[PDB]
RNA sequence: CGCGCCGGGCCGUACCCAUAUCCGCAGCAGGUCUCCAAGGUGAACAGCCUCUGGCAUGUUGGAACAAUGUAGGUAAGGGA
RNA sequence: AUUCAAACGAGAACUUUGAAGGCCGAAGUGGAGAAGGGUUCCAUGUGAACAGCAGUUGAACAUGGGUCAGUCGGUCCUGA
């Protein structure tokens, strides 16, 4: 389909897309920004550590109320978190992406994420019950994720 | 598997609450295909499910 | 060499000190599990049911001060995992604890 | 209620046979816009009146 | 456990002189005029035997050291030179302290007072201790079961 | 009075019956009529512990143990 | 007021079994009904949505099943 950014040399690149992924957009945009420029093998290793709380995700933009951690100093930041679900979703998308490189016939151990985008998806509808017999919305904020890897020696 | 049909059926055949029904944990796969009170009574004779004794409330 | 077994005396008292009543016994099962992952450097720690029963013997609040255990590190069998070794912690009934070193039992 | 009248029981019979989803093959018809049954009543949400 | 009125209305800001919650302790402090009662001498070896009678006075003449029974709680045993200061000084146990000479001329008879200690209490601080030494303690208890 | 023979149609019948099947916009600490009722202590259908029966702590866990809370306590000497 | 192990499973703090520790404590968190609900009952299957975390579970969803009377009620009688 129509990707937000087209690779300069499609012969040396593979894509992967996800739609309506029931995972918090704000958490996923932050973990995607940290994974952006790094090599693919460095990415999977990093994302696995986020699930084990050995490396954090610096919450740059959506940081209101986000607590301070000691591992955020590796990013020149103060606030960080370890979004487990958000990491394991786009840990699968990397798995699907490098699977496309295998099918396209690419050297997987030279792939570098260079485009990773997280868009908002249509919101889901639940409701909560408040005092004095009121009903308030309880929306979920899922997301669309599409990334593009490229070989870079 | 999940054995809550059997534990209910066993309690009804033994005329005792399901608090006292003992399903042999080593032989789940044989109790899983009971599905019937007739097959439950066969597991009574084979000793696969037992009616546990009453908890002691000594009056001594 | 790497498949070893040895007795230990865990001082539950000094690893439970401070925690609340409704959590003293459950914390004891965590401090035991942490104890094994220190001596036998294996993440997979399987504690025996009779050891569980020995910790909950006095209820949830009052937990035995010392406890004798047999840490035996074995080869992880099938059910393939990164964990090639696991530690089985077993309970050792003992009358007293005086002069109880960490002996190195063998098989 | 376990004590019912024949009027009521026959009425509840109708509202029970209407609660089924639409058959799969109807939206293979030519001039078919129906996507799903919009009159599905759930016994806990909608209380059937009476 | 609060301050009811923070400030008035028209100085529309809360002032810096109003009490607010926050960090307490671990502040840098300097209190002056702490008199030195005794500059003790550490343990030293001499002719094979060691010398430890630090807390010995000219009136006690006992072989007991400055160390109370069971060592200083949460600190250890003092085997080096020490200084004995009157009253309490800032900080917790093990806390490194800086000892500075006085900035002022000491010309009060309180500051010019000569000190001769008569007794240094080395009973155990790890409880309600009641013995100065171990030699005194077992001489009172007599023999115990573990003998 | 004893025995024998024939007949008895129609409608309801599952389950829940309440810290999740009912009413409160909801799996809502509210509300909603009854039946049966063990042992010990004790005046007792009180409170507390237990057996028969039932349950998983009431729409989540983990790690800490700061301030303010909420709910329990205790306080030298004095005693509103 | 939970804990250990096992089984199933792509996946288990939450399902199931076993063990342990607890609670309800017969004016019950037990066993049955009236009113009301109306298929929620039962079995198999699924895991999109829903069950304010999760779920291999469910009162969700999809297929099928299930309520048997001369004697129990209605029916009959009259009450305000």
Curated annotation (Swiss-Prot), chain A:
Stretch forming the signal peptide: none
Biological process terms in GO annotation: cytoplasmic translation
GO molecular function: structural constituent of ribosome
Localization terms from the record: Cytoplasm
Keyword Ribonucleoprotein among record annotations: yes
Source taxon at top rank: Eukaryota
Keyword entries, A-Z: Cytoplasm, Ribonucleoprotein, Ribosomal protein
Gene Ontology CC: one annotated term: cytosolic large ribosomal subunit
Main location: cytoplasm
Role description: Component of the large ribosomal subunit. The ribosome is a large ribonucleoprotein complex responsible for the synthesis of proteins in the cell.
Record's subunit section: Component of the large ribosomal subunit.
Entry's family note: Belongs to the universal ribosomal protein uL22 family.
Listed name of the protein: Large ribosomal subunit protein uL22
UniProtKB/Swiss-Prot annotation, chain B:
Intracellular or extracellular location(s): Cytoplasm
Highest rank taxon of the organism: Eukaryota
Residues with Citrulline modification: 4, 15
Modified residues (Phosphoserine): 12
PTM annotation: Citrullinated by PADI4.
Physiological role: Component of the large ribosomal subunit. The ribosome is a large ribonucleoprotein complex responsible for the synthesis of proteins in the cell.
Family: Belongs to the eukaryotic ribosomal protein eL19 family.
Subunit structure: Component of the large ribosomal subunit.
Descriptive protein name: Large ribosomal subunit protein eL19
Organism (species): Oryctolagus cuniculus (Rabbit)
Protein encoded by which gene: RPL19
Residues shown, of full length: 2 to 61 of 196
Swiss-Prot record, chain C:
Naturally occurring in which organism (per UniProt): Oryctolagus cuniculus (Rabbit)
PROSITE patterns for the chain: RIBOSOMAL_L31E
Job description of the protein: Component of the large ribosomal subunit. The ribosome is a large ribonucleoprotein complex responsible for the synthesis of proteins in the cell.
One Gene Ontology cellular component: cytosolic large ribosomal subunit
Places the protein is found: Cytoplasm
Name under which the protein is recorded: Large ribosomal subunit protein eL31
Cited CDD domains: Ribosomal_L31e
GO biological process: cytoplasmic translation
Quaternary organization: Component of the large ribosomal subunit.
Modified residues annotated as N6-succinyllysine in this record: 38, 53, 58
Domain of life of the native organism: Eukaryota
Any matching Pfam family: Ribosomal_L31e
Ranges in a coiled coil: none
Modified residues annotated as N6-acetyllysine in this record: 58
One GO molecular-function entry: structural constituent of ribosome
Keywords: Acetylation, Cytoplasm, Phosphoprotein, Ribonucleoprotein, Ribosomal protein
Residue numbers bearing the Phosphoserine modification: 81
Family: Belongs to the eukaryotic ribosomal protein eL31 family.
UniProtKB/Swiss-Prot annotation, chain E:
One GO MF term attached to the UniProt entry: structural constituent of ribosome
Name of this protein: Large ribosomal subunit protein uL3
Keyword tags: Acetylation, Cytoplasm, Isopeptide bond, Methylation, Nucleus, Phosphoprotein, Ribonucleoprotein, Ribosomal protein, Ubl conjugation
Record keyword Nucleus present: yes
Cross-link Glycyl lysine isopeptide (Lys-Gly) (interchain with G-Cter in SUMO1), where in sequence: 46
Full-sequence range covered: 249 to 395 of 403
Modification after translation, per record: It is not required for incorporation of RPL3 into ribosomes.
Main location (coarse class): nucleus
GO terms (BP aspect): translation
Purpose: Component of the large ribosomal subunit. The ribosome is a large ribonucleoprotein complex responsible for the synthesis of proteins in the cell.
Native organism taxonomy: Eukaryota, Metazoa, Chordata, Craniata, Vertebrata
Subunit structure: Component of the large ribosomal subunit. Interacts with DHX33.
Compartment(s) of residence: Nucleus, Nucleolus; Cytoplasm
Family recorded in the similarity comment: Belongs to the universal ribosomal protein uL3 family.
Record has Aminoacyl-tRNA synthetase as a keyword: no
Cross-link (Glycyl lysine isopeptide (Lys-Gly) (interchain with G-Cter in SUMO2)): 38, 118, 138, 145
Positions bearing Phosphoserine: 56
Gene Ontology CC, one term: cytosolic large ribosomal subunit
Modified residues (N6-acetyllysine): 38, 46, 118, 125
